[PDB]
Amino acid sequence: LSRRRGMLKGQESEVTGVKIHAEVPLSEMFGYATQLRSLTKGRASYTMEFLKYDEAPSNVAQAVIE
Amino acid sequence: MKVRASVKKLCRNCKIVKRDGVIRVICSAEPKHKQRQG
Amino acid sequence: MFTINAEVRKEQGKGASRRLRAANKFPAIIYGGKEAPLAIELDHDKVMNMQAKAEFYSEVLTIVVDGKEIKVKAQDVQRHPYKPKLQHIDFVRA
Amino acid sequence: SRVAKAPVVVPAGVDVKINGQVITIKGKNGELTRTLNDAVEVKHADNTLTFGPRDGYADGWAQAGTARALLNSMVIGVTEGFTKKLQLVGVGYRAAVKGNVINLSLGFSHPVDHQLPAGITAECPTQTEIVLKGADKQVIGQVAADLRAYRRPEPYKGKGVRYADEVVRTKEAKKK
Amino acid sequence: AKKVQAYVKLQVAAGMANPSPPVGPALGQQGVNIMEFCKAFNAKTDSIEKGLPIPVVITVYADRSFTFVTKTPPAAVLLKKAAGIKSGSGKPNKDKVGKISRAQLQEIAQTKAADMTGADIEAMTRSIEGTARSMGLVVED
Amino acid sequence: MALNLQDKQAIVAEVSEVAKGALSAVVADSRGVTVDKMTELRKAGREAGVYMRVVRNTLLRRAVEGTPFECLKDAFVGPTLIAYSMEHPGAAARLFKEFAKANAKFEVKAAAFEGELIPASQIDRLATLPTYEEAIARLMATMKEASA
RNA sequence: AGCCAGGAUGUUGGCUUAGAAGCAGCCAUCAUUUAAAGAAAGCGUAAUAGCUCACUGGUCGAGUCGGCCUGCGCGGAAGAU
Ligand SMILES: [Mg+2]
Ligand SMILES: [Mg+2]
Ligand SMILES: [Mg+2]
Ligand SMILES: [Zn+2]
């Protein structure tokens, strides 16, 4: 989550798993499922929805040039 | 192992040994610290 | 308290001075009082260890130059331009 | 020094038989065994051995020290006898022992069949354990070493031939 | 107790032993019974007081049920509801910000008499000095 | 460590406990935990507080350097690991008792309790002690003697 | 130097963090209990947990530690008939 240019915000330890809470950019979550699986032996749901817009890191920004 | 010209201890467990004509470094904890051409 | 054995210099000049320093000796001079100056030659490692203490430059100290005890104070020191060694010392007669 | 300088008891029942520079030592079990020394001076008499430098070898002492140490393990060797103890780890890892040859099944496409050298013999409490007793310390080490070599313990599931006093790494994999 | 076996302390609360987002499940799920810390805890709760910080250890092996133990409150925390300010800085401790009650520190420490090594109850004070010079907050002694 | 100026204090202090003491026990703390000390300090605690010690020193070279003073019955204790215990006030007391009861809760060996000095001798757990003030066992020896 | 032991209590110091529990950072670095044990020298942890060190007790039994100056050497060092 951190590697994915992400900010973390909480942990519960909800019963058996451990819900982890984070704000992580869209252009960076692509194909999460695939790897989240690899990291947790297939045992790991996840979910996401829109939250906000924040500044894009420069190398990102100057890349995003049409 | 790393080869280098300057070798020196890294961990507190790195040890330094002169085998054959060559100066070496052996770490019992951390393989990354092996060194030769010293 | 500092006791410095020494010997009067039999040779003077750039030539000798260098020679002395090759043999862990080193020249220095005692002057002051109303009597003439005196050309001294000191054992190096000794004065070095001695002058390691700060008292060396403050205290009065004694030089036993051919059995006399002249008793003087360190005026000036010449250290090597880039080594840890001494080149020369001025001693004032007290 | 120290190790050189310390003496070394010859426990009741042992032979010893110096002849110039060739010690030999029999005891309870064990094919005796025989080393050579060089710039060492070995001194019997007493119920001990003692080692010291020989005039004119700058290598002396360091030599004596080894010498003492070697002789020592011979005494301890031919008397108590020496240890061993290996254990297999990994699905499908058998060990047999027919006479003086271990029969290992280490997930290869062929058997291995490692023949024990001379003064060394092997047993198998389980299909996943090998203890081999012997007198000659230098060799006993070697054979276990050889045995470990057929499949050095890999660091992900520790699979392969272990010692037992080993430490074995183990790293978190990291797909992908 | 001459033999430790399992202990995790995550300061709970008295008035209702039935959390869920803070602790809840994570306080009892490996041979532990969520049903019995509201049967048993509260049996040792109301005799004293309710609401405030409670670290705790329990006696669960893999034996189904258990028996609950009690403990003691944090000591630099008795400098919150037992001193003044409830943070500890505001000006990072490059600045010596806090402020003390010298009277307190002994009897408010003494309240933690059952968990300290000093024989001299005055000694048990001298510990609270550094515990309360934790910022560099001087005491008007 | 410290030089002599400090090896002397551990003496002049520790030997004026012998010169001004009461009872002596014994114990070898191979495995001496710290829940160990913790407890025995509360025991010293009950047994006053800091009236008691145990200063590990069995360097013959130390807590025998306090022996050719008094208690030269301890040239023989001092070998190997030891934990010397001195009493100032208190009965020739209970100090004795819990060391056996403690170490008989595993709490490590007790040197087989090589024992010590009140008399000038050796081993054997006695509660011939803190009955002390059991002069009541000579009060009941009154009315019962007067009556019976 | 080995080897046996211990290596603790306030307490996750305070701050700051999603989490900083000896150990990412900032400020502090006291006080207990002591034989000794850093508000911690390193491994480790999501964070705790877990393994060590410093330090002291034991064993052992005479030398041992590391800087300064200097002589001679070692690596550093691959090329084309
Ligand atoms: Mg080679
Ligand atoms: Mg010239
Ligand atoms: Mg070349
Ligand atoms: Zn290393």
Question: Sign of the CA dihedral B1, B7, B10, B15?
Answer: positive
- Tell me, yes or no, whether F142 lies in a domain: no
Given an 8 Å threshold on Cβ–Cβ distance, is F45 in contact with E119? yes
Kindly report each contact of residues E120-123 with a partner whose C-beta sits within 8 Å and lies 24 or more positions away, as own/partner: E120/F49
Run of H or E including F6: helix F4-7
Same domain, E52 and E18: yes
Provide the domain limits for residue E130.
72-140
Residue ending a domain, among E33, E55, E71, is E71
In contact, A22 and A12? CB cutoff 8 Å: no
Dist CA E8 CA E24 (whole Å): 14
Same domain, E94 and E47: no
Which pair of tokens denotes residue C30?
């005692």
The listed CATH number (3.90.380.10, 2.40.240.10, 2.40.30.10, 3.40.1160.10) that belongs to domain C1-94: 2.40.240.10
Dist CA D99 CA A57 (whole Å): 71
What resolution, expressed in A, was reported for this entry? 2.9
Same domain, E45 and E85: no
Which pair of tokens denotes residue C46?
């000794």
Q: Which residue's CA is nearest to the C1' of nucleotide G43? A: B29
Could you tell me where the DSSP H helices lie in F8-124? Answer: 9-18, 34-46, 60-63, 95-103
- Please state the domain extents for chain C: 1-94
Angstroms from E20 CA to nearest CA on chain A: 8
Chain G bases under 7 Å from protein CB?
4-16, 18-19, 25-28, 30-37, 39, 41-43, 45-46, 48, 55-59, 64, 68-70, 74-77
Separation of CA C52 and C1' G64 in angstroms? 27
B3 touches strand G (CB under 7 A): no
Q: How many domains does chain F divide into? A: 1
Residue ending a domain, among E71, E87, E122, is E71
F53 touches strand G (CB under 7 A): yes
Dist CA C86 CA C25 (whole Å): 9
CATH number, residue F87: 3.30.70.1730
CB contact, 8 Å: E29 with chain A?
Answer: yes
Strand, coil or helix: what is C17? helix
Dist CA E110 CA E78 (whole Å): 11
F86 touches strand G (CB under 7 A): no
Amino acid sitting at position E51: G
Run of H or E including C74: strand C72-79
* Residue D34: DSSP 8-state: E
Residue ending a domain, among E46, E71, E96, is E71
Which pair of tokens denotes residue A44?
């790991």
Q: How many domains does chain E divide into? A: 2
The experimental method behind these coordinates is: X-ray
Amino acid sitting at position D4: A
F84 touches strand G (CB under 7 A): no
Provide the domain limits for residue F15.
1-130
- CA dist E98 → E2, E93, E104, E124, F54 (Å): 41, 10, 15, 22, 41
Surface of A (7-66) touching E: CB under 8 A: 12-16
Count of C-beta atoms within a 10 Å radius of residue F119: 8
- Domains in chain D (CATH in brackets) are 8-76 (3.90.930.12), 82-163 (3.90.930.12)
Cis peptide before D176 (omega within 30 of 0): yes
Given an 8 Å threshold on Cβ–Cβ distance, is F105 in contact with E2? yes
| Torsion on CA atoms E36, E42, E43, E45, rounded to nearest 10 | 140
